[PDB]
Symmetry: D2
Subunit: 169 residues, 4 copies
């Protein structure tokens, strides 16, 4: 404990990058002709979700589910049916990617038209499970990050920018 | 709605048959040496579970989970099943779609083994080929209630399998 | 760890006592004329529930819900509506009775015709919250008990009798 | 089903108004000295939540829970609210029955304080007198979509409040 939080990725940059992802995702699914649904993973992705779905220019539905994070359980499942639909799993950050990996499996069992993942942050150096991530906002080093849905000691989860925690001696 | 309920499978037969299944399951897992866990599907299997686990002579844990076109997990397991022998316990299997998917979901967790044990089985109503390792009774497609199976929120607590008789 | 389990309350005695409770509960609600529902608290009461409902001679519905056991949360709620109905909360054992206490409050908010609790075992000496328990199978001293839904180290939960754990030196 | 959607409350107005609510809520709790937590009700409030919490200038935690004649808890809080200031965050309040009960349930947990903040309010549709401490917009009983509010699984992601126009 005993620390400080400084801006790592300012709000404007995050907003800009999200607008971009928005375009990319739209370009990618605009001609599918099938129902689409963005699936966020609570709690972490509520903010990134809120902002990302507004940038996606294709009629979709927004849903959430929460998984345990040694077995991976479903604490809260989807309300929507994804069978035959294009599904985009939306996450705040991917590091080890175990949980994500299993959630993807579980969902595919429901036979969606397609399955992809879009994360705001990516820590490639911390991967433990090879998992296909189709959209990334920022590839970052293994930094102690907070904000945009990411918390630390039940704090900072509501910050509008990605911050770096500095552990004072 | 206007109906009657008559005994189809009396309580004694059910108890006897369960004692048997009990032996079968015990014989089958007694030498595994791995942790075991019976997983019941709520609400339907609470009674069959309660009785079946008492007949299983191997140290196991008892857990439940409840499932919902897409098949969802309304309540998940509390236990981890990875590397453990898992026996899904159900009151009755007919179409077997839900069961089928629940089995898939669980296998993703990599248990040592996966099996299903149902009290009742209506083979004539299957829609999904699903492996059922233990069966108490194979029955015709009858309107059944009791032992966890209800009808209009009734009979779920009957100690025997009953047949519903619609009245015209 | 390192222990033994010996019979404290044999299966026959438990069966007999439950048949009795069965009669008592029936006598008590037989003339209500309102829908009835026994609500069990998972995991512990699945066995006591299974046996008790078979002794209750009044048409009822059986349901479950699971609560966290410092705030008391609802991990799994009822499927049935209890408003205007006679509700009997069914538990394997009551000791401190905090959780039970709160679950009772939560449910009353739904305005059931009536609310009662029926427990197999009762450890009066361990109460921390004064809570009304209308039916009791056995009042026991604060013994290390297992069986009939009560476990210890994920074991014995399936025993058909109440056992006493003996911690070998 | 055959319809159109036109802008009722443009995105800019909503952002502005939220910044204001932000100030109000901050002014109100800045000196509490107790832990604070905004509790959103899924699905509807995920967007309003996301934007509102960024305007609240006091260290808080963000949590959600989802509720269902009887009002049930489909998903409960992860946080404990006892002794903490709790702000229930909703997209819109009309009849307010569900909200009303959720408030009761939570108070049973003895939080330091309990308040509600809704983006939209349809006073004309109230059925249960429930205290709403913060409101973004008081609107007539219009067919609204956007900002978390959907219609036929659509528009939930619109950045503005829209009005649905049925076509005959
Ligand atoms: Mg995440
Ligand atoms: Mg079943
Ligand atoms: Mg209990
Ligand atoms: Mg709402």
């Amino acid at each position: 404990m005993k620390h400080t939080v400084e801006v790592m990725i300012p709000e404007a940059e995050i907003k800009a990058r999200i607008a971009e992802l928005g375009r990319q995702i739209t370009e990618r699914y605009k001609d599918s002709g099938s129902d689409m649904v963005l699936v966020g993973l609570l709690r972490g992705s509520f903010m990134f979700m809120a902002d990302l779905c507004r940038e996606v220019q294709v009629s979709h539905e927004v849903d959430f589910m929460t998984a345990s994070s040694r077995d991976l359980k479903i604490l809260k499942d989807l309300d929507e049916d994804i069978r035959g639909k294009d599904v985009l799993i939306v996450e705040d950050i991917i590091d080890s990617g175990n949980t994500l990996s299993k959630v993807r499996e579980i969902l595919s069992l429901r036979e969606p038209k397609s399955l992809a993942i879009c994360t705001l942050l990516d820590k490639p150096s911390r991967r433990e499970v090879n998992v296909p991530v189709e959209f990334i906002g920022f590839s970052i080093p293994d930094e102690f990050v907070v904000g945009y849905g990411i918390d630390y000691a039940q704090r900072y989860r509501h910050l509008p920018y990605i911050g770096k925690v500095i552990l004072l001696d």
